[PDB]
């Protein structure tokens with residue numbers, strides 16, 4: 001099937017993705033049929049970037065689980081770029097619903113506890129709660 | 134193991150491939166399991182074409198290593214079809230990454246230094262740098 005090349009990551013997976021000129025960026029792995037483009041080359045994945053909803057063909061060697069959060073969260077980029085803060089919001093929101101996590105009740109202010117939850121290791125489910133389906 | 138008929142080219146190799154009615158086209162040799170089709174016949178190879186990401190079963194004798202770049206690159210086709218130019222970009226991009234080569238950073242514009250690198254034998258690495266792994 002699609003993405004049956006031995007490498008990691010399948011459809012639905014929340015990932016960090018690395019492309020030239022950008023900090024690690026949160027994304028969702030999608031099927032090529034969602035992209036309106038073409039099938040990924042072997043060992044690549046199509047991902048859709050949180051925050052801007054664009055698609056990129058990214059090597060699987062340039063992706064890591066979003067659950068490895070503190071290891072790829074870029075604090076400098078976060079402070080610098082409103083777009084990265086929005087990406088974080090939409091990415092963590094998707095994570096929060098998957099994990100069955102809920103927070104008490106702006107943007108900065110809504111991000112704050114999802115960001116702590118993420119940086120803290122996604123307790124109580126851990127990364128296990130970030131899986132799709 | 135698949136493709137052990139003694140012939141040339143293994144999974145991951147970057148190649149030029151010739152099919153009826155087309156110029157030599159860049160591709161990667163894939164396992165039949167990535168194709169969502171069938172196993173390959175004796176002495177055949179599945180290849181995935183750069184640019185369109187499509188799959189074809191090709192004889193291991195209608196295939197040359199991508200390293201023989203200038204001999205098979207087709208300037209008339211390049212100037213004529215944007216599809217070939219895109220195919221070229223993606224193939225060299227994969228080549229670039231495997232080699233550890235880097236280019237200071239448009240299409241044709243991004244293409245010109247990669248393409249000069251290939252026409253000149255992929256220095257400082259040679260064709261040894263296009264191999265998989």
Ligand SMILES: CCCN(CCC)CCCC#N
Nearest residue numbers: 019022025049052054081083
């Ligand atoms: C097509 C890529 C757009 N980029 C996705 C992450 C690399 C985010 C752009 C917003 C910024 N900075």
Ligand SMILES: CCCN(CCC)CCCC#N
Nearest residue numbers: 152155158182185187214216
């Ligand atoms: C060998 C090249 C074949 N390729 C796809 C074959 C299904 C067409 C390339 C697009 C053009 N022109």
